[PDB]
Amino acid sequence: HHHATLTVPTTVPSVSEDCEQLRKAFSGWGTNEGLIIDILGHRNAEQRNLIRKTYAETYGEDLLKALDKELSNDFERLVLLWALDPAERDALLANEATKRWTSSNQVLMEIACTRSANQLLHARQAYHARYKKSLEEDVAHHTTGDFHKLLLPLVSSYRYEGEEVNMTLAKTEAKLLHEKISNKAYSDDDVIRVLATRSKAQINATLNHYKNEYGNDINKDLKADPKDEFLALLRSTVKCLVYPEKYFEKVLRLAINRRGTDEGALTRVVCTRAEVDLKVIADEYQRRNSVPLTRAIVKDTHGDYEKLLLVLAGHVEN
């Protein structure tokens, strides 16, 4: 029944104990990565937050900071991106994505489109606390053209999340998206509008009408130019909004296929979805690739990084 892959022990040690074991894992010379993976890879956000707070109180030092001074590169990055509270994690990924990076990034779209209205808000507040600015200003500041016009309201929505649908409106807007798309007015106010403003149930209804009325789902009519970076973002927005698990499966597939250009795509999907819908994602990977996620992802991995990655993905005893 559950969709997350994180596994927590039926019995959970006192935060004070975790802290003791964690401090020990990087005391003296050298480090004990198996111990860090074992404790942090099996603690939920609340537990992880308590651990970090109890640590700094007990030892007067920031736990994540300590870890960043001791661990190996690829591993440390996985440990840190995972360890963060989901809201802090999002804030951090959105910030990186506005930095020197071809702002139109799919990471901004991903965070805006696959989070609850409340997860998005919380990330925004963590963004406030850490960068003393708003995610929206950084996005408006760093992106341009069509990308700017789509991503600004994406990162800013606080979507209605009820099941109510307006069939009439969906039909009219389905036709509307069609015209616009047909005329190549890809970043039209109405396109942007339906995608960045309407509820997900309303959006799915709109797109189901699109297929009814036109036979194909909107995405096939969004490839006029296979090279156009914007159409690409629009196709990924649709998937994220109405088919999140297929979006994530393909990001994983292109990553493993060593054919993607999203470097931390692997680290990012696992760290951000293991507490959410990674099991569903893994099921979809299985279905689309005939190979289980935990088996496919280790083609180019090894060591402590692989160990933690598999643990976040649901790996257990053997």
mmCIF file of C-alpha atoms in Angstrom:
data_model
loop_
_atom_site.group_PDB
_atom_site.id
_atom_site.type_symbol
_atom_site.label_atom_id
_atom_site.label_comp_id
_atom_site.label_asym_id
_atom_site.label_seq_id
_atom_site.Cartn_x
_atom_site.Cartn_y
_atom_site.Cartn_z
ATOM 1 C CA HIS A 1 0.000 0.000 0.000
ATOM 2 C CA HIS A 2 2.664 2.645 0.841
ATOM 3 C CA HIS A 3 4.476 4.593 -1.868
ATOM 4 C CA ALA A 4 7.723 5.635 -0.067
ATOM 5 C CA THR A 5 10.921 3.560 0.009
ATOM 6 C CA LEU A 6 12.510 4.883 3.145
ATOM 7 C CA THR A 7 12.578 2.124 5.764
ATOM 8 C CA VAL A 8 12.692 2.947 9.462
ATOM 9 C CA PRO A 9 13.455 0.492 12.262
ATOM 10 C CA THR A 10 10.381 -0.771 14.075
ATOM 11 C CA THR A 11 12.310 0.480 17.138
ATOM 12 C CA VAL A 12 14.005 3.905 17.009
ATOM 13 C CA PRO A 13 17.048 4.784 19.262
ATOM 14 C CA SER A 14 17.126 7.946 21.340
ATOM 15 C CA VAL A 15 18.186 10.934 19.346
ATOM 16 C CA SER A 16 20.889 11.254 22.047
ATOM 17 C CA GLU A 17 22.135 7.792 21.089
ATOM 18 C CA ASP A 18 22.075 8.516 17.340
ATOM 19 C CA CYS A 19 24.111 11.606 18.046
ATOM 20 C CA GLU A 20 26.589 9.572 20.057
ATOM 21 C CA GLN A 21 26.994 7.015 17.295
ATOM 22 C CA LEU A 22 27.121 9.701 14.615
ATOM 23 C CA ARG A 23 29.755 11.779 16.449
ATOM 24 C CA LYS A 24 31.715 8.535 16.851
ATOM 25 C CA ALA A 25 31.546 7.716 13.129
ATOM 26 C CA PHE A 26 33.747 10.676 12.353
ATOM 27 C CA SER A 27 35.720 11.041 15.573
ATOM 28 C CA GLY A 28 39.504 10.539 15.588
ATOM 29 C CA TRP A 29 41.121 9.855 12.252
ATOM 30 C CA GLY A 30 39.095 8.286 9.511
ATOM 31 C CA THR A 31 35.375 7.766 9.209
ATOM 32 C CA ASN A 32 32.816 4.996 9.641
ATOM 33 C CA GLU A 33 30.525 5.443 6.637
ATOM 34 C CA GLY A 34 28.552 2.230 7.319
ATOM 35 C CA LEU A 35 27.407 3.657 10.628
ATOM 36 C CA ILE A 36 26.377 7.045 9.142
ATOM 37 C CA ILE A 37 24.417 5.306 6.356
ATOM 38 C CA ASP A 38 22.756 2.996 8.824
ATOM 39 C CA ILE A 39 21.478 5.730 11.134
ATOM 40 C CA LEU A 40 20.691 8.595 8.656
ATOM 41 C CA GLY A 41 19.474 6.356 5.808
ATOM 42 C CA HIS A 42 16.761 5.001 8.147
ATOM 43 C CA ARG A 43 15.373 8.117 9.871
ATOM 44 C CA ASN A 44 12.475 10.275 8.712
ATOM 45 C CA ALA A 45 12.479 14.050 8.409
ATOM 46 C CA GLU A 46 11.301 14.625 11.943
ATOM 47 C CA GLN A 47 13.898 12.272 13.340
ATOM 48 C CA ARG A 48 16.619 13.803 11.190
ATOM 49 C CA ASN A 49 15.690 17.274 12.238
ATOM 50 C CA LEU A 50 15.712 16.261 15.916
ATOM 51 C CA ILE A 51 19.076 14.607 15.445
ATOM 52 C CA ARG A 52 20.636 17.712 13.941
ATOM 53 C CA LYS A 53 19.158 19.890 16.716
ATOM 54 C CA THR A 54 20.184 17.526 19.539
ATOM 55 C CA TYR A 55 23.688 17.347 17.975
ATOM 56 C CA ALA A 56 24.355 21.053 17.834
ATOM 57 C CA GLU A 57 23.058 21.359 21.406
ATOM 58 C CA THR A 58 25.173 18.516 22.682
ATOM 59 C CA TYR A 59 28.347 19.236 20.748
ATOM 60 C CA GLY A 60 28.036 22.915 19.834
ATOM 61 C CA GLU A 61 28.731 22.081 16.193
ATOM 62 C CA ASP A 62 26.536 21.725 13.134
ATOM 63 C CA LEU A 63 26.253 18.037 12.225
ATOM 64 C CA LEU A 64 25.907 18.487 8.438
ATOM 65 C CA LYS A 65 28.828 20.863 8.474
ATOM 66 C CA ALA A 66 30.951 18.387 10.323
ATOM 67 C CA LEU A 67 30.036 15.726 7.806
ATOM 68 C CA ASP A 68 30.927 17.937 4.874
ATOM 69 C CA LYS A 69 34.440 18.298 6.241
ATOM 70 C CA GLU A 70 34.938 14.534 6.611
ATOM 71 C CA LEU A 71 33.271 12.584 3.823
ATOM 72 C CA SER A 72 34.078 11.561 0.279
ATOM 73 C CA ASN A 73 32.647 13.759 -2.511
ATOM 74 C CA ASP A 74 29.873 11.868 -4.289
ATOM 75 C CA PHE A 75 28.883 10.236 -0.969
ATOM 76 C CA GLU A 76 28.819 13.493 1.042
ATOM 77 C CA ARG A 77 26.592 15.128 -1.560
ATOM 78 C CA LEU A 78 24.087 12.232 -1.356
ATOM 79 C CA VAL A 79 24.230 12.208 2.482
ATOM 80 C CA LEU A 80 23.735 15.959 2.695
ATOM 81 C CA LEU A 81 21.018 16.337 0.054
ATOM 82 C CA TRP A 82 19.186 13.426 1.701
ATOM 83 C CA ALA A 83 19.656 14.537 5.310
ATOM 84 C CA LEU A 84 18.040 17.944 4.908
ATOM 85 C CA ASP A 85 14.402 18.428 5.811
ATOM 86 C CA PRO A 86 12.450 18.096 2.564
ATOM 87 C CA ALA A 87 11.670 21.814 2.634
ATOM 88 C CA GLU A 88 15.373 22.724 3.111
ATOM 89 C CA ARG A 89 16.365 20.246 0.383
ATOM 90 C CA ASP A 90 13.976 21.866 -2.142
ATOM 91 C CA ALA A 91 15.122 25.369 -1.233
ATOM 92 C CA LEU A 92 18.710 24.230 -1.850
ATOM 93 C CA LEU A 93 18.026 22.544 -5.197
ATOM 94 C CA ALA A 94 15.981 25.521 -6.439
ATOM 95 C CA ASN A 95 18.760 27.882 -5.462
ATOM 96 C CA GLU A 96 21.436 25.858 -7.306
ATOM 97 C CA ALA A 97 19.181 25.751 -10.281
ATOM 98 C CA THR A 98 19.007 29.565 -10.491
ATOM 99 C CA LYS A 99 22.796 29.809 -10.225
ATOM 100 C CA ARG A 100 24.920 30.192 -13.371
ATOM 101 C CA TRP A 101 22.768 27.282 -14.682
ATOM 102 C CA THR A 102 20.872 27.547 -17.971
ATOM 103 C CA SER A 103 17.954 29.062 -16.079
ATOM 104 C CA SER A 104 14.899 27.431 -17.630
ATOM 105 C CA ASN A 105 16.242 24.435 -15.802
ATOM 106 C CA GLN A 106 13.994 21.526 -15.498
ATOM 107 C CA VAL A 107 14.773 21.343 -11.799
ATOM 108 C CA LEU A 108 12.682 24.510 -11.149
ATOM 109 C CA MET A 109 9.817 23.046 -13.117
ATOM 110 C CA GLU A 110 10.196 19.736 -11.207
ATOM 111 C CA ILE A 111 10.084 21.278 -7.787
ATOM 112 C CA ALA A 112 7.112 23.521 -8.701
ATOM 113 C CA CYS A 113 5.154 20.753 -10.412
ATOM 114 C CA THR A 114 5.562 17.666 -8.248
ATOM 115 C CA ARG A 115 5.103 19.107 -4.773
ATOM 116 C CA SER A 116 1.929 19.732 -2.846
ATOM 117 C CA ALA A 117 0.892 23.407 -2.600
ATOM 118 C CA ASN A 118 1.997 23.154 1.006
ATOM 119 C CA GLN A 119 5.344 21.486 0.185
ATOM 120 C CA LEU A 120 5.986 24.277 -2.259
ATOM 121 C CA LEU A 121 5.087 26.884 0.355
ATOM 122 C CA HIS A 122 7.330 25.251 2.914
ATOM 123 C CA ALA A 123 10.269 25.178 0.519
ATOM 124 C CA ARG A 124 9.588 28.877 -0.083
ATOM 125 C CA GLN A 125 9.805 29.614 3.579
ATOM 126 C CA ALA A 126 13.044 27.614 3.881
ATOM 127 C CA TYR A 127 14.251 29.588 0.871
ATOM 128 C CA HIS A 128 13.376 32.791 2.838
ATOM 129 C CA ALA A 129 15.257 31.672 5.960
ATOM 130 C CA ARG A 130 18.415 30.577 4.126
ATOM 131 C CA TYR A 131 18.845 33.065 1.308
ATOM 132 C CA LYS A 132 16.995 36.094 2.669
ATOM 133 C CA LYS A 133 15.193 36.382 -0.630
ATOM 134 C CA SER A 134 12.274 34.734 -2.416
ATOM 135 C CA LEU A 135 12.537 31.782 -4.713
ATOM 136 C CA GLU A 136 10.345 33.804 -7.150
ATOM 137 C CA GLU A 137 12.718 36.730 -7.273
ATOM 138 C CA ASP A 138 15.667 34.512 -8.013
ATOM 139 C CA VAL A 139 13.679 32.720 -10.753
ATOM 140 C CA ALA A 140 12.453 35.971 -12.265
ATOM 141 C CA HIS A 141 15.936 37.345 -11.981
ATOM 142 C CA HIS A 142 17.741 34.410 -13.508
ATOM 143 C CA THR A 143 15.472 33.090 -16.265
ATOM 144 C CA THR A 144 14.338 34.789 -19.489
ATOM 145 C CA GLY A 145 12.068 34.542 -22.490
ATOM 146 C CA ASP A 146 9.553 31.770 -22.615
ATOM 147 C CA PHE A 147 11.237 30.054 -19.718
ATOM 148 C CA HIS A 148 10.830 33.093 -17.487
ATOM 149 C CA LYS A 149 7.214 33.414 -18.460
ATOM 150 C CA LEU A 150 6.404 29.846 -17.525
ATOM 151 C CA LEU A 151 8.563 29.179 -14.490
ATOM 152 C CA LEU A 152 7.753 32.381 -12.575
ATOM 153 C CA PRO A 153 4.158 31.542 -12.047
ATOM 154 C CA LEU A 154 5.027 27.803 -11.670
ATOM 155 C CA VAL A 155 7.227 28.445 -8.636
ATOM 156 C CA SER A 156 4.651 30.877 -7.247
ATOM 157 C CA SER A 157 1.398 28.928 -7.380
ATOM 158 C CA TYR A 158 -0.417 27.879 -4.255
ATOM 159 C CA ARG A 159 -2.762 25.431 -5.992
ATOM 160 C CA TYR A 160 -6.250 24.422 -5.132
ATOM 161 C CA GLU A 161 -6.108 20.731 -4.310
ATOM 162 C CA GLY A 162 -9.673 19.499 -4.264
ATOM 163 C CA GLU A 163 -11.176 17.001 -6.624
ATOM 164 C CA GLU A 164 -13.767 19.382 -8.086
ATOM 165 C CA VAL A 165 -13.664 19.575 -11.853
ATOM 166 C CA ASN A 166 -15.363 22.028 -14.261
ATOM 167 C CA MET A 167 -16.026 19.936 -17.326
ATOM 168 C CA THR A 168 -17.265 22.831 -19.400
ATOM 169 C CA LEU A 169 -14.146 24.906 -18.768
ATOM 170 C CA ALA A 170 -11.872 21.899 -19.415
ATOM 171 C CA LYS A 171 -13.421 21.408 -22.833
ATOM 172 C CA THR A 172 -13.090 25.043 -23.776
ATOM 173 C CA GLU A 173 -9.558 25.204 -22.462
ATOM 174 C CA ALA A 174 -8.626 21.990 -24.188
ATOM 175 C CA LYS A 175 -9.660 23.625 -27.451
ATOM 176 C CA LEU A 176 -7.783 26.744 -26.369
ATOM 177 C CA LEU A 177 -4.491 25.002 -25.711
ATOM 178 C CA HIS A 178 -4.969 23.333 -29.087
ATOM 179 C CA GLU A 179 -5.321 26.529 -31.086
ATOM 180 C CA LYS A 180 -2.388 28.209 -29.365
ATOM 181 C CA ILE A 181 -0.167 25.180 -29.801
ATOM 182 C CA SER A 182 -1.335 24.779 -33.357
ATOM 183 C CA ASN A 183 -0.390 28.392 -34.107
ATOM 184 C CA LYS A 184 2.972 27.820 -32.434
ATOM 185 C CA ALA A 185 2.090 30.433 -29.794
ATOM 186 C CA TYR A 186 3.677 28.078 -27.308
ATOM 187 C CA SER A 187 4.118 30.451 -24.409
ATOM 188 C CA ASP A 188 0.724 32.080 -24.740
ATOM 189 C CA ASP A 189 -0.920 33.496 -21.665
ATOM 190 C CA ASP A 190 -3.587 30.781 -21.871
ATOM 191 C CA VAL A 191 -1.077 27.911 -22.132
ATOM 192 C CA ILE A 192 0.912 29.246 -19.202
ATOM 193 C CA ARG A 193 -2.319 29.877 -17.447
ATOM 194 C CA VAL A 194 -3.792 26.403 -17.639
ATOM 195 C CA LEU A 195 -0.455 24.826 -16.668
ATOM 196 C CA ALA A 196 0.706 27.168 -13.861
ATOM 197 C CA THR A 197 -2.588 28.138 -12.257
ATOM 198 C CA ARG A 198 -5.414 25.471 -12.435
ATOM 199 C CA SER A 199 -5.808 22.520 -10.001
ATOM 200 C CA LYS A 200 -4.244 19.176 -11.036
ATOM 201 C CA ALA A 201 -7.625 17.452 -11.202
ATOM 202 C CA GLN A 202 -8.815 20.378 -13.395
ATOM 203 C CA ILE A 203 -5.723 20.083 -15.506
ATOM 204 C CA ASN A 204 -6.046 16.329 -15.967
ATOM 205 C CA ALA A 205 -9.703 16.852 -16.977
ATOM 206 C CA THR A 206 -8.609 19.461 -19.442
ATOM 207 C CA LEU A 207 -6.019 17.172 -20.973
ATOM 208 C CA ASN A 208 -8.386 14.151 -21.117
ATOM 209 C CA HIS A 209 -10.683 16.395 -23.171
ATOM 210 C CA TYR A 210 -7.791 17.366 -25.359
ATOM 211 C CA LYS A 211 -7.264 13.716 -26.343
ATOM 212 C CA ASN A 212 -10.973 13.087 -26.750
ATOM 213 C CA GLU A 213 -11.434 16.061 -29.022
ATOM 214 C CA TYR A 214 -8.154 15.513 -30.899
ATOM 215 C CA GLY A 215 -7.217 11.845 -30.499
ATOM 216 C CA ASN A 216 -3.712 12.334 -29.171
ATOM 217 C CA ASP A 217 -2.558 13.673 -25.851
ATOM 218 C CA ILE A 218 -1.212 17.216 -25.939
ATOM 219 C CA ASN A 219 2.432 16.125 -25.866
ATOM 220 C CA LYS A 220 2.538 14.663 -29.359
ATOM 221 C CA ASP A 221 1.490 18.072 -30.675
ATOM 222 C CA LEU A 222 4.400 19.573 -28.740
ATOM 223 C CA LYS A 223 7.319 18.334 -30.742
ATOM 224 C CA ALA A 224 7.255 20.537 -33.874
ATOM 225 C CA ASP A 225 10.912 21.044 -33.167
ATOM 226 C CA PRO A 226 12.583 18.163 -31.306
ATOM 227 C CA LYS A 227 15.464 20.526 -30.536
ATOM 228 C CA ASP A 228 13.453 23.445 -29.067
ATOM 229 C CA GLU A 229 14.359 23.612 -25.338
ATOM 230 C CA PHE A 230 11.054 25.252 -24.426
ATOM 231 C CA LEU A 231 8.693 22.665 -25.942
ATOM 232 C CA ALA A 232 10.782 20.147 -24.014
ATOM 233 C CA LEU A 233 10.052 21.997 -20.804
ATOM 234 C CA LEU A 234 6.375 22.179 -21.630
ATOM 235 C CA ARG A 235 6.221 18.390 -22.256
ATOM 236 C CA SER A 236 7.944 17.757 -18.893
ATOM 237 C CA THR A 237 5.502 20.183 -17.144
ATOM 238 C CA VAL A 238 2.475 18.215 -18.417
ATOM 239 C CA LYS A 239 3.999 14.906 -17.235
ATOM 240 C CA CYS A 240 4.922 16.332 -13.865
ATOM 241 C CA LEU A 241 1.486 17.754 -13.372
ATOM 242 C CA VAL A 242 -0.602 14.740 -14.425
ATOM 243 C CA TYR A 243 1.859 11.803 -14.760
ATOM 244 C CA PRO A 244 4.538 12.427 -12.079
ATOM 245 C CA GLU A 245 5.682 8.783 -11.921
ATOM 246 C CA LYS A 246 6.366 8.645 -15.635
ATOM 247 C CA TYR A 247 8.331 11.880 -15.433
ATOM 248 C CA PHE A 248 10.520 10.530 -12.723
ATOM 249 C CA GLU A 249 10.946 7.114 -14.408
ATOM 250 C CA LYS A 250 12.182 8.722 -17.583
ATOM 251 C CA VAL A 251 14.551 11.081 -15.686
ATOM 252 C CA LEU A 252 16.008 7.951 -14.071
ATOM 253 C CA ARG A 253 16.100 6.071 -17.347
ATOM 254 C CA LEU A 254 17.954 8.854 -19.166
ATOM 255 C CA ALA A 255 20.317 9.223 -16.263
ATOM 256 C CA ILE A 256 21.254 5.522 -16.066
ATOM 257 C CA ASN A 257 21.384 5.429 -19.878
ATOM 258 C CA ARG A 258 24.324 7.798 -19.287
ATOM 259 C CA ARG A 259 22.636 9.824 -22.049
ATOM 260 C CA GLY A 260 21.153 12.556 -19.898
ATOM 261 C CA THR A 261 22.671 15.944 -19.245
ATOM 262 C CA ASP A 262 21.167 16.149 -15.721
ATOM 263 C CA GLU A 263 24.323 15.253 -13.697
ATOM 264 C CA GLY A 264 22.842 14.876 -10.199
ATOM 265 C CA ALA A 265 19.592 13.583 -11.690
ATOM 266 C CA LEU A 266 20.112 10.227 -9.907
ATOM 267 C CA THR A 267 20.950 11.723 -6.541
ATOM 268 C CA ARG A 268 18.108 14.247 -6.867
ATOM 269 C CA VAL A 269 15.269 11.854 -7.754
ATOM 270 C CA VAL A 270 16.144 9.373 -5.007
ATOM 271 C CA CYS A 271 16.717 11.950 -2.247
ATOM 272 C CA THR A 272 13.555 13.857 -3.128
ATOM 273 C CA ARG A 273 11.138 10.957 -3.730
ATOM 274 C CA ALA A 274 12.180 8.208 -1.306
ATOM 275 C CA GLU A 275 9.913 9.747 1.302
ATOM 276 C CA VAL A 276 7.271 10.330 -1.276
ATOM 277 C CA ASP A 277 6.446 8.054 -4.283
ATOM 278 C CA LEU A 278 9.776 6.355 -5.162
ATOM 279 C CA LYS A 279 8.163 2.847 -4.760
ATOM 280 C CA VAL A 280 5.579 3.890 -7.399
ATOM 281 C CA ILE A 281 8.337 5.323 -9.407
ATOM 282 C CA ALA A 282 10.368 2.113 -9.098
ATOM 283 C CA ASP A 283 7.260 0.119 -10.162
ATOM 284 C CA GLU A 284 7.014 2.275 -13.213
ATOM 285 C CA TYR A 285 10.720 1.862 -13.929
ATOM 286 C CA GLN A 286 10.240 -1.946 -13.700
ATOM 287 C CA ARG A 287 7.323 -1.767 -16.143
ATOM 288 C CA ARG A 288 9.065 0.467 -18.696
ATOM 289 C CA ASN A 289 12.460 -1.193 -18.546
ATOM 290 C CA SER A 290 11.862 -4.845 -17.511
ATOM 291 C CA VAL A 291 14.597 -4.388 -14.912
ATOM 292 C CA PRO A 292 14.076 -3.370 -11.226
ATOM 293 C CA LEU A 293 15.312 0.100 -10.238
ATOM 294 C CA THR A 294 17.741 -1.148 -7.604
ATOM 295 C CA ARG A 295 19.396 -3.287 -10.257
ATOM 296 C CA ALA A 296 19.588 -0.791 -13.133
ATOM 297 C CA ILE A 297 20.911 2.275 -11.147
ATOM 298 C CA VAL A 298 24.157 0.694 -10.027
ATOM 299 C CA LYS A 299 25.657 0.398 -13.513
ATOM 300 C CA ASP A 300 27.923 3.423 -12.929
ATOM 301 C CA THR A 301 27.887 3.449 -9.127
ATOM 302 C CA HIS A 302 29.936 1.910 -6.324
ATOM 303 C CA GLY A 303 31.019 2.148 -2.685
ATOM 304 C CA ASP A 304 29.411 4.199 0.039
ATOM 305 C CA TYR A 305 27.455 6.254 -2.488
ATOM 306 C CA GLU A 306 25.888 3.126 -3.983
ATOM 307 C CA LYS A 307 25.311 1.702 -0.530
ATOM 308 C CA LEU A 308 23.275 4.748 0.672
ATOM 309 C CA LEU A 309 21.478 5.148 -2.654
ATOM 310 C CA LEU A 310 20.199 1.499 -2.480
ATOM 311 C CA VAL A 311 19.222 2.020 1.176
ATOM 312 C CA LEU A 312 17.141 5.116 0.221
ATOM 313 C CA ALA A 313 15.602 3.058 -2.550
ATOM 314 C CA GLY A 314 14.286 0.387 -0.203
ATOM 315 C CA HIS A 315 17.146 -2.109 0.008
ATOM 316 C CA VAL A 316 17.171 -4.190 3.200
ATOM 317 C CA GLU A 317 18.883 -7.374 4.473
ATOM 318 C CA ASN A 318 20.156 -10.108 2.108
#
